[PDB]
């Protein structure tokens, strides 16, 4: 179903069935360049294992 | 043809803390180590390299085993082996990554407008030579069409 996203009243064109869970990279994990992330207030669903996660360039340090 | 490990053979270091630096074999320890020195470079003092980390080049100064560290600087000056290496294409690929690994975002933009220039010119030269000879797929099919339609 189309549940309620942000800018529901301000921007009714981004109203979608699309949801999103958010997190932060906390620390590296091993020598091979994997990251150890924690999602905000919850955990990532186990359905997401093997599925696409986007990591961003913000918050910026450079 | 492969280039032998001998005293005088210039090797390039593969993946040490050097990764790109050339050096001259001044002594062979055993079946897997040599002594490597290039007096022209600061980081290339007389050290011990494993032969899994070296790559023998086509150049070889006429110097003896366990040289005197001042007749080595004489040997690669008369041979001009560092300058013959400095105009090869593989050495240009070494100094090209050193620009890419030091590029700012503005000189990555300059490389993109340089490559889009050359690409735009090579596809309009390819245009105005495919009208004369029917080479491409647009021009083979139209040449075998207008001859019978």
């Amino acid at each position: 179903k189309v549940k309620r996203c942000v800018r529901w009243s301000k921007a009714p064109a981004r109203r979608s069935t699309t949801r999103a869970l958010w997190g932060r990279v906390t620390r590296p994990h091993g020598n091979a360049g994997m990251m150890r992330v924690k999602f905000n207030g919850a955990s990532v669903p186990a359905s997401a294992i093997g599925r696409r996660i986007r990591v961003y360039l913000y918050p910026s340090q450079i | 043809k492969s280039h032998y490990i001998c005293a005088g053979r210039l090797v390039r270091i593969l993946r040490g803390p050097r990764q790109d630096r050339v050096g001259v074999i001044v002594d062979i320890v055993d079946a897997n180590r040599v002594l490597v020195e290039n007096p022209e470079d600061a980081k290339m003092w007389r050290h011990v390299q494993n032969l899994k980390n070296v790559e023998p080049l086509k150049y070889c100064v006429s110097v003896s085993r366990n040289c005197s560290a001042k007749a080595l600087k004489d040997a690669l000056a008369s041979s001009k082996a560092l300058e013959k290496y400095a105009k090869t294409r593989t050495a240009a690929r070494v100094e090209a990554k050193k620009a890419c690994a030091a590029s700012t975002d503005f000189e990555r933009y300059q490389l993109r407008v340089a490559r889009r220039s050359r690409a735009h010119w090579a596809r309009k030269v390819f245009d105005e030579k495919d009208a004369k000879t029917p080479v491409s797929w647009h021009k083979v099919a139209l040449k075998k069409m207008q001859k019978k339609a």
Binding site: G50 | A96, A99, E107, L111, S117, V135
Partner: protein, 221 residues
């Protein structure tokens, strides 16, 4: 699996463009059988869609007589009470590799069944796989870096033809007919491959010279 009329009318009601998923196609000529299988078993389980090609060219270390006996010790196993419920012994090189991948997966969950149905594993290069992009390779598993060249090795298409697998000669005539066909296609366009590179050397000095000494700093001349 051809798409049904419910899956065909929706590609007409919605004007569906012809879609291909992001599929990585490995050419397994001269690869270590279990080193390639472990690289593939990890990538499939990280969500990669992988088509595997040329499984009759995989290598297993040791004498051909040695690896053929190890398959016959495997074929000795069967459920004695009812062998229709037994271990099923697949003889194709394309099916030996699917098993070797599968025994490196969590086979008895749904995440390991979603990853074993992401692998296809042909043998030879079939006509649907040929013109779909350049094949890739696994350079940490390629027998010229992984086997000591004095030691014998065993081509999987030759071990498997003597334990079963009655389609060895069919694959050998489908791949003789391909390399003859793909070398006729490659003598063609040699006046197209030379046409572009004599236009990419001619694009220099027809382009402005302040974009060439930035094209020579980064070594792209």
């Amino acid at each position: 699996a051809f798409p049904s009329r419910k899956d065909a009318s929706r590609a007409q009601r919605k004007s569906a463009k012809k879609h291909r998923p992001e599929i990585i196609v490995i050419d397994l000529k001269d690869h270590v059988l279990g080193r390639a299988a472990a690289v593939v078993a990890k990538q499939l389980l990280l969500g990669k869609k992988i088509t595997v090609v040329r499984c009759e060219q995989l290598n297993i270390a040791g004498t051909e007589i040695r690896n053929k006996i190890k398959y016959l010790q495997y074929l000795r196993k069967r459920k004695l009470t009812n062998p229709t419920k037994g271990p099923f012994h697949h003889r194709a090189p394309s099916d030996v590799f699917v098993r070797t991948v599968r025994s490196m997966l969590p086979r008895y969950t749904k995440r390991g069944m979603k990853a074993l149905n992401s692998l296809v594993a042909y043998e030879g290069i079939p006509p649907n796989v040929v013109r779909t992009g350049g094949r890739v390779v696994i350079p940490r598993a390629q027998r010229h870096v992984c086997y000591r060249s004095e030691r014998p090795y065993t081509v999987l298409g030759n071990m498997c033809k003597h334990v079963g697998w009655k389609y060895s000669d069919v694959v050998a005539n489908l791949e003789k007919a391909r390399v003859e066909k793909a070398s006729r296609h490659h003598e063609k366009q040699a006046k197209l491959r030379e046409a572009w590179k004599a236009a990419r050397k001619e694009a220099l000095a027809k382009m402005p010279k302040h974009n060439v000494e930035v094209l020579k700093k980064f070594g792209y001349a």
